[PDB]
Subunit: 62 residues, 6 copies
Amino acid sequence: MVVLKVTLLEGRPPEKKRELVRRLTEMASRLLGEPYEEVRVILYEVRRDQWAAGGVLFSDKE
Amino acid sequence: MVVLKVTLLEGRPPEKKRELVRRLTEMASRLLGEPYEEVRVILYEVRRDQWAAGGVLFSDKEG
Amino acid sequence: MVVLKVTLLEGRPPEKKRELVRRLTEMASRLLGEPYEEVRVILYEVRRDQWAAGGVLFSDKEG
Amino acid sequence: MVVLKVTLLEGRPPEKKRELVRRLTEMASRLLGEPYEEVRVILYEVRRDQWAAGGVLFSDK
Amino acid sequence: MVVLKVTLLEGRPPEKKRELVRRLTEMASRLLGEPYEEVRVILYEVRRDQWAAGGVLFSDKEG
Amino acid sequence: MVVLKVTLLEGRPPEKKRELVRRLTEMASRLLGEPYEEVRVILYEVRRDQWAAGGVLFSDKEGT
């Protein structure tokens, strides 16, 4: 088993999440030689007021 | 201090969650000899639209 | 790059979150010779019904 | 499936860790109705020089 | 930006790891519209004696 | 309780880690109204062949 955790800002439409999960899964499965069904993906969506870069929260930089 | 982080799909009823937290604490305290106050449990509940296996998001669950 | 992840209970005012972030970034930046832009902070806010100490979920405490 | 991550200082005896994994799995499996093989445990062992409380690294006692 | 954390058993050859990182980076950048240079990947390689499934540590299962 | 996890490359000297842990514990204890004993810091040190930016692992960037 291999788990891919993607940290990204929330807001992505369902179709985009679905595409991302499908492509990452195919790629990891083949490349690592893991059973397709054994590849897990978790999307950790962060709020803009929970992520900062260069000392500034994205809720403010927005 | 010992921290048990449980990653599971959202949806479990409160009773089951409080029962899980209780059992994990009692076992961890015992087996590792940690004081109850030092045993912390964090429930990382993942949404159905954020949890995938076999390239399929649970929210898309084919069934 | 340096990543700081803060795990804390939900509920802190945006004012304090904003200051914690600026400060943690400054301290981490100078003490580690990392450029400002290369310092990231993520706030993992946990709900009261996902946070437990001593076998008790905070959502189960009165008040 | 369910994943249980245990963050604890390194140094515990192998049998304590084995027992912990076994007990955690049985209990999570039965309690959450998850198949025994679908329960996963990850032991995140932290070094004494990477763990602090009260501003003091445990390596510094 | 976007961070991809891969949790997998330790032991993969350097070439496998660099290809994995390249593939994940191009795909994440492509599908999410994130600058290729901003995509970060961290490999959380777990020891065989820290990874269990079905109540058994991989180190015991394999050895 | 507040937990601060710092992800950084392995290698910083003891004194530097000690100072980092002190300063961070100072700022967090202050702004979040938390007693020292309740501010935990974990240093998640990653090796150069486990961290990548722009599709390049720090290990390959430094050469072989």
